[PDB]
Fold this protein.
Amino acid sequence: RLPPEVNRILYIRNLPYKITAEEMYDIFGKYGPIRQIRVGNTPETRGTAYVVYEDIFDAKNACDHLSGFNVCNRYLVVLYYNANRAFQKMDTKKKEEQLKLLKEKYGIN
Amino acid sequence: XXXXXXXXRXXXXXXLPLX
Amino acid sequence: MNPLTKVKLINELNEREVQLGVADKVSWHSEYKDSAWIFLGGLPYELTEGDIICVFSQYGEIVNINLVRDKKTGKSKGFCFLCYEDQRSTILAVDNFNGIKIKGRTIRVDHVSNYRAP
Amino acid sequence: PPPLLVYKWCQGINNLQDVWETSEGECNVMLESRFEKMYEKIDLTLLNRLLRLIVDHNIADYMTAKNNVVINYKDMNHTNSYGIIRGLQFASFIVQYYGLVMDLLVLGLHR
Amino acid sequence: TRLYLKAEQERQHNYLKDGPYITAEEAVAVYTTTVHWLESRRFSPIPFPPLSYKH
Amino acid sequence: RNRPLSDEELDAMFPEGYKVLPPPAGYVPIRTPARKLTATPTPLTGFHMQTEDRTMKSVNDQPSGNLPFLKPDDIQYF
Amino acid sequence: KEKPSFELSGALLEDTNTFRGVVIKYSEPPEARIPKKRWRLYPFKNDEVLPVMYIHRQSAYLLGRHRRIADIPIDHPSCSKQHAVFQYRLVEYTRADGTVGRRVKPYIIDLGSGNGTFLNNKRIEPQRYYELKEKDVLKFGFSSREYVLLHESS
Amino acid sequence: VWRNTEDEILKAAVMKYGKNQWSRIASLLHRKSAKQCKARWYEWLDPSIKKTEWSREEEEKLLHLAKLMPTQWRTIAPIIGRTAAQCLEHYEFLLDKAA
Amino acid sequence: ADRKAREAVEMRAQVERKMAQKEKEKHEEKLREMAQKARERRAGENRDISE
């Protein structure tokens, strides 16, 4: 029952600078589990954050509810992320070793 | 100081007749 | 031409006649006014009669059911012939059920012209 | 609509308690009047502050600075600093808000 | 139209010269009374319209 | 599709200039209790006068200059 | 091989009451609703009270030992996989003036558990709706903890 | 917006026609109305308008006024002698240099 | 006048807050007492059942 552009990763700007990570975490865990959080550091990215949720529904109803939230004298501008490019190679060696684990363990072939 | 706080706040906390 | 295109084309038939503004008497279904038999195809191989009927009874009483299963193993081939009680219900069913997803498989409906019993 | 308003007034009067009895010397008065120059005496500084009580200060300042403009007819131009321009699209709101302040003056906070 | 705009030009100049006509005690009593009203009705102020606003 | 992802998946999808952090080990433990039981422990105004400021005025969302209007989704790209 | 059945198959119930890869047996009646009286569950573990459960904001709550689906994971292995359902079902009645109306009340239903659901420590007959009244206590499986039902004004 | 070329054609028109015949002056320009010609002359092009920097007398004025009559720039402006747009931008300017 | 009024508004707002909050604390304690007592009375048909 979701529109596909829904993601478990959303892009947030209009944050207070230097905003306390703990606040970040509970402000956003007013919805559920946060898998990961990244805040920009270079001044260009300063003030915005990518947030990776561990649940599709968590992320989506967050994007439904909080978009239009005002903390710290500014409305929190959010959007879904378009994870449409990769940024480095997927490391064949460990990949095939962990799948070799899979197969060695569960006796497929 | 003392009388300031006392009378001032006793007036504020009953300054609105509707409450 | 895989069956999903045969679904898409029946739906195109409907919405095209809608754009053209055809009267209910010269609908393409009018060529079928003497047969209360629809063919369902694409069905999954685990659905039984009980399911086909519990699904397709929405539009009338079902008089006959004919699920065609491979004679050697008895398992369904994946298509059915179904005889409603009033031709008009076949109108309704073809318009309404063609293209629904049942368990991922997107089944397809269409009338039958000169059905031959088995 | 206004004719159903008239109807509701009439039967509101009729439904007050003992509103018709004059046995013991009561009297009912119905008074009706106007405000004679409201839109023309609205003051834009007091209006700024009464509006900030109600809106965000950005909107308050927009409204008040929108009322203070130059008004032009063929070669006569003057600046409006006192009254209120009624041909602004949010004039309804300003007039009804100021009017509410004055209904509080006439009635009293208790009544 | 011309006679009205002559009179209205004069009304505005007279305002700036003979000062504001709402004294100071009248202005403060009006302001304070309004504040008391709104505070007793528990009104909450309309905020400036957000950009991510639904309507 | 919803199937959770790993640390290098996350570094593979995000761009650079980014610092990664679970805020506390308790904010990680908050996440641990948050998902576990979220059934409300207490389901939580009036007139207040406002204190004038500048910040919401000061936030800008359109490229200053003689550039066109930047829609509310290509924010991601531009 | 097999014959032309006239009996059901889990396909329909599967695709409809699927959730996180466990077909749910029970589904919400037509008359469900969300309560305005805000009800609260007070849990005790042998006279040691626990944090309270405010259950006023759904139409039904399903309790079972399968935690990744249910609302309130009962975790003493006597607890069924999908065990019981709190459910606010709007029922009508005859007010003092006979005028009929509807208030949403809370009901319990057993989903066919192994051991059973104890209201007043009486085992109930499964797959039926039992009306939950003021101050009543409920006990799941043969498990240690009990729950009292109240609402804010009570 | 307005370009140096329109502006100089305006200046010349006005200096020939005078400041009440905006309709023929607006006929002289393309993509311009009499409303806009008039607004431009009385906002920027008029040689009475001064484009200098603020004497600190002028700025203490600006601050005192903009507090006494808040948001009323067409009224404040003539009391100090520059247009309302200049007064307003320079006032925000002092405010943020002070913030 | 607005400085003054903002201070008065805030002081009464916080007074009111505090009073209401302490009353609801009292209320919660009443509730928990009643719950425990009902558990005890239970330790020691005016109902609706369905088919």
Summary: The longest helix of chain D spans residues 91-107.
